[PDB]
């Protein structure tokens, strides 16, 4: 999920944007 | 720099990139 992908590990803009409405 | 985005920081980043369009968890 997002915190694993972005908080625990580092995510890119692209990955982050996959969770915008 | 620290590239991790946790809690408040993640929301802020999501607000920034996703715009007033908004973000889903």
State the Cα–Cα distance between residues B19 and A20, nearest whole angstrom: 8
* Encoded tokens for B19: 């715009």
Q: How was this structure determined?
A: X-ray
Q: Which helix (H) or strand (E) holds A16?
A: helix A13-17
* Encoded tokens for A18: 């996959």
* Encoded tokens for B8: 């408040």
Whether the CB of B11 is below 8 Å from some CB of chain A: the reply is: no
Domain extent listing, chain B:
1-25
Q: Which residues are A20's β-sheet partners?
A: B23
Hunting for tokens 């607000």 — which residue is that? B15
Q: Are B8 and A3 in contact (CB under 8 A)?
A: no
Counting one residue from A and one from B, how many pairs have CB atoms under 8 Å apart? 46
Residue B19 sits at the vertex; the CA angle it makes with A14 and B2, to the nearest 5 degrees, is 50
Residue B14's CB is within 10 A of a number of other CB atoms, namely 22
State the Cα–Cα distance between residues B1 and A18, nearest whole angstrom: 23
């Amino acid at each position: 999920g997002i915190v694993e992908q972005c908080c625990t590990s580092i995510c890119s803009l692209y990955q982050l944007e996959n969770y915008c409405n | 720099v620290n590239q991790h985005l946790c809690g408040s920081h993640l929301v802020e980043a999501l607000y920034l990139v996703c715009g007033e369009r908004g973000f889903f968890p």
